[PDB]
């Protein structure tokens, strides 16, 4: 008769939106779904209290990077049955399928719900005035840096601010997504954060490939293509700066396309110049590959649930095509289920089509039980590198020393 589901604040009216999403299921099954919205400030510790105590909801949202840890606690019900009903492994991008279980595991313990991915938004008016061909700028790392250098030299002023635009706005260390902002560059240089090599998971942040990609990215800020002020800010603050006409290029997710249609009094930017001058391109091809950061959230069923068959029906509903389209639109995310990408709500919008192009390059972190420790240690040492950038002190050798320290700490944490 009732299911309890915990979600995070994924949409503008989290509880109301989720209740609208599930109303057809409630009517069809004659059950009530009770949703509780967990601040990302408290979600993780509420979810581990549920895991340790055996007292919790039926379903919980998990960040994709949380799946290995909570799975490793032995508290999640297998959901291979749900995933088979939805079309099995080949219904998902490989990157997304990796997030359905603890890394390496035979059985699924999480159902893909929606995907976060990042692509570059750009000011089409700024690139035109700089003489920057958007295709060349996003076809190679040399192209990207050459585009930022032309944007730096440009006399273009934003029509509202009457000031130059920064070529690239990115956070540095003061954001939740420090590693995610770096990951595409690591990967595109042929690197990785961790590798399963020489008979164990170990850091690869100090590999020559990883170092090349990290140095490429962080050196763009040292060369003057990123404002000093951006390095103090988080991702949300950078979004606001791009809305406000301060930034020619920045990475973000699909939600900005919706925000460009929403009035400022409702937290969008439809009244600003940027809303009418918006382009999107995937991350540029690196020397050793081309990768798009994927994250987002999955759903899991606690093994202590008293309602497992009904909760599995609700996972099949939430994971299936109609609800995938609807909730991706409510959240400004991309559906997890690839069949949902053909919906006209995506295909009729050229900017969302470019996000689907970006999705083809998708890559996630390994689903390690100890992922949060790896990421935390990687980000402490990436922040030390961003501190050198902020002072104009980043060199290849100083970066190598920081990633050797990171690698020692990560490798201890993985033992």
Ligand X SMILES: OC[C@@H](O)[C@@H](O)CO
- Pick the stretch among 48-56, 159-167, 182-190, 321-329 that binds its own copies (CB under 8 A): 48-56
d(CA 52, CA 7): 19
Residue 341 · residue 39 · CB < 8 Å: no
> Which of Cl ion, ligand X, its own copies, none interacts with 357 (beta carbon under 5 to 8 A by kind)?
ligand X
Closest approach of ligand X to the CB of residue 354, in Å: 5
23 Cβ neighbours under 8 A, 6+ residues apart: none
Total residues interacting with its own copies, rule: CB under 8 A = 39
- Pick the stretch among 161-169, 319-327, 342-350, 380-388 that binds its own copies (CB under 8 A): 380-388
Helices (H), 320-366: 321-331, 344-347, 350-359
Tokens standing for residue 74: 């032995």
Closest approach of its own copies to the CB of residue 228, in Å: 11
Q: What are the E-state strand segments in 185-232?
A: 194-197, 200-203
Closest approach of ligand X to the CB of residue 260, in Å: 17
Closest approach of its own copies to the CB of residue 63, in Å: 10
Binding residues for Cl ion restricted to 352-371, rule: CB under 5 A:
363-364
Binding site for ligand X (CB under 6 A): 350, 353-354, 356-357
**CB of 9 or CB of 321, closer to its own copies:** 9
Among the listed residues 55, 73, 153, 163, the single contact to its own copies using CB under 8 A: 55
Instruction: For residue 23, state whether it binds its own copies (rule: CB under 8 A).
Output: no
Tokens standing for residue 9: 């604040």
Distances (CA, A) of 51 to 13, 68, 299: 27, 13, 14
Closest approach of its own copies to the CB of residue 213, in Å: 22
d(CA 195, CA 374): 12
Among the listed residues 383, 400, 404, 414, the single contact to its own copies using CB under 8 A: 383
d(CA 205, CA 178): 14
Binding mask 43-72 for Cl ion (x = CB under 5 A): ------------------------------
Among the listed residues 73, 153, 176, 393, the single contact to its own copies using CB under 8 A: 176
Position of tokens 């635009």?
Answer: 165
Cα angle 60-63-68, degrees, rounded to a multiple of 5: 90
For helices 321-331 and 308-319, angle between their N-to-C axes, nearest 10 degrees = 70
Cα angle 281-208-376, degrees, rounded to a multiple of 5: 70
Residue 397 · residue 96 · CB < 8 Å: no
> Which of its own copies, ligand X, Cl ion, none interacts with 379 (beta carbon under 5 to 8 A by kind)?
its own copies
- Contact footprint for Cl ion (CB under 5 A): 34-35, 95, 98, 105-107, 192-193, 363-364, 395-397
Q: What residues make contact with its own copies under the rule CB under 8 A? A: 9, 13-16, 34, 36-37, 39-42, 44-46, 49-50, 52-53, 55-56, 173-176, 232, 234, 372-373, 376-377, 379-380, 383, 387, 405, 409, 412-413
């Amino acid at each position: 008769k009732t299911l309890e589901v915990w979600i995070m604040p994924n949409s503008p009216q989290p509880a109301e939106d989720f209740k609208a999403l599930v109303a057809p299921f409630e009517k069809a099954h004659g059950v009530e779904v009770k949703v509780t919205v967990l601040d990302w400030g408290v979600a993780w510790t509420k979810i581990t209290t549920a895991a340790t105590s055996g007292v919790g909801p039926d379903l919980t949202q998990l960040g994709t990077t949380w799946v290995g840890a909570i799975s490793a606690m032995g508290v999640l019900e297998p959901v291979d049955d749900v995933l088979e009903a939805l079309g099995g492994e080949k219904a998902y991008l490989p990157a997304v399928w990796r997030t359905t279980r603890l890394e390496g595991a035979r059985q699924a313990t999480a159902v893909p719900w929606f995907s976060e991915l990042r692509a570059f938004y750009y000011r089409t008016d700024a690139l035109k005035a700089a003489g920057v061909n958007p295709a060349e700028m996003f076809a190679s790392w040399q192209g990207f840096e050459a585009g930022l250098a032309r944007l730096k030299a440009s006399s273009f002023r934003d029509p509202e601010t009457k000031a130059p635009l920064a070529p690239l706005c990115t956070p540095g260390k003061n954001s939740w997504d420090v590693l995610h902002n770096a990951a595409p560059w690591i990967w595109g240089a042929g690197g990785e954060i961790v590798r399963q090599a020489g008979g164990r998971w170990q850091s690869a942040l100090n590999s020559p490939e990883s170092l090349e990609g990290l140095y490429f990215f962080l050196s763009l800020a040292q060369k003057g293509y990123v404002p000093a002020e951006s390095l103090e800010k988080n991702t949300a603050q950078i979004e606001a700066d791009f809305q406000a006409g301060k930034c020619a290029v920045f990475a973000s997710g699909p939600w900005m396309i919706q925000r460009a249609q929403v009035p400022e009094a409702k937290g969008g930017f439809a009244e600003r110049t940027a809303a009418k001058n918006l382009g999107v391109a995937p991350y540029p091809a690196g020397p050793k590959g081309r990768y798009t950061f994927f994250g987002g959230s999955n759903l899991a069923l606690f093994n202590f649930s008293k309602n497992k068959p009904l909760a599995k029906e609700l996972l099949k509903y939430l994971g299936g095509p109609e609800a995938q389209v609807r909730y991706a639109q409510m959240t400004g995310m991309l559906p997890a289920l690839r069949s949902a990408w053909s919906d006209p709500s995506f295909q009729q919008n050229p900017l969302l089509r470019t996000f689907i192009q970006a999705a083809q390059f998708g890559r996630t972190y390994p689903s390690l039980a100890g992922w949060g420790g790896v990421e935390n240690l990687a980000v402490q040492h990436l922040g030390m590198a961003w501190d050198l950038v902020a002072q104009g002190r980043l060199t290849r050798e100083a970066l190598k020393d920081l990633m050797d320290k990171a690698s020692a700490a990560i490798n201890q944490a993985l033992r």
